[PDB]
Design an enzyme around this catalytic site. Structure first.
Site, PDB file in Angstrom:
ATOM      1  N   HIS A  41       0.816  -1.239   0.000  1.00 14.19           N
ATOM      2  CA  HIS A  41       0.000   0.000   0.000  1.00 14.19           C
ATOM      3  C   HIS A  41       0.849   1.289   0.000  1.00 14.19           C
ATOM      4  CE1 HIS A  41      -0.080  -0.505   4.585  1.00 14.19           C
ATOM      5  NE2 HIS A  41       0.100   0.812   4.507  1.00 14.19           N
ATOM      6  N   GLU A  72       0.889  -8.367   0.650  1.00  8.87           N
ATOM      7  CA  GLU A  72       1.097  -6.984   1.185  1.00  8.87           C
ATOM      8  C   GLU A  72       2.587  -6.637   1.355  1.00  8.87           C
ATOM      9  OE1 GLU A  72      -1.230  -4.952   0.816  1.00  8.87           O
ATOM     10  OE2 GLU A  72      -0.366  -3.158   1.822  1.00  8.87           O
ATOM     11  N   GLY A 146       1.068   5.618  11.195  1.00  7.50           N
ATOM     12  CA  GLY A 146       2.509   5.907  11.284  1.00  7.50           C
ATOM     13  C   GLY A 146       3.351   4.693  11.656  1.00  7.50           C
ATOM     14  N   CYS A 148       3.151   1.657   9.914  1.00 11.80           N
ATOM     15  CA  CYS A 148       3.246   0.723   8.765  1.00 11.80           C
ATOM     16  C   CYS A 148       4.703   0.669   8.297  1.00 11.80           C
ATOM     17  CB  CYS A 148       2.237   0.999   7.649  1.00 11.80           C
ATOM     18  SG  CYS A 148       0.527   0.671   8.187  1.00 11.80           S
TER      19      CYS A 148
END
Length: 181
Positions: A41, A72, A146, A148
């Site tokens: 992402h 991911e 904040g 990730c």
């Protein structure tokens, strides 16, 4: 404070950079040579900022399992003039559950941040932001925007990178040795 935080700190001090895309600032784990990982992402493009320096992306691969399901994890090769310490020997070979994990973050917003998250479950399937995702680890900590890209470790293992949360639980994508042969 103790040997969990000691291993986490050793990884952060040598194997992390601050990555900035058009989607934000992320903790980025360097694994070996010029190869690093970031959540998919983050939408890595042709150019990324590494510690506020404009860096060409030589390759970027958004990993999916053999069922064509999102993992991911994006593997990035950076046009950087310096290699990372090789930490592939700290990566697990198989999917597993863990005790006593630490989540470690380093950004402009959250420098030198370490969180004892406790027990980590092999959760498996998660609908992450609407996207079916596999190989998810779960910990019962109220992780926030904040975090990730934050690195999940136990003593002697680098097991995942933080990819989301639901206000009460946090979720990491597994790292496996086989991603980096």
């Amino acid at each position: 404070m103790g040997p969990g935080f000691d291993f986490a700190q050793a990884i952060m001090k040598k194997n992390t950079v601050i990555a900035r895309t058009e989607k934000g600032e992320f903790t980025m784990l360097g694994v070996y040579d010029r190869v690093a990982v970031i959540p998919t992402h983050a939408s890595v493009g042709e150019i990324i900022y590494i510690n506020d320096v404009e860096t060409r992306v030589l390759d970027a691969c958004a990993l999916r399992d053999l069922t064509d399901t999102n993992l991911e994890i994006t593997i990035v090769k950076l046009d950087r003039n310096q290699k990372f310490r090789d930490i592939r020997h700290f990566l697990p070979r198989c999917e597993d559950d863990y005790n006593d994990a630490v989540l470690s973050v380093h950004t402009s917003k959250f420098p030198n941040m370490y969180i004892p998250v406790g027990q980590v479950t092999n959760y498996g399937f998660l609908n992450l932001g609407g996207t079916p995702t596999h190989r998810i680890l779960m910990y019962n900590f109220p992780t926030r925007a904040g975090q990730c890209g934050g690195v999940v470790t136990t003593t002697g293992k680098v097991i995942g990178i933080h990819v989301g949360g639901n206000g009460a639980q946090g979720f990491a994508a597994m790292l496996l040795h086989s991603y980096f042969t």
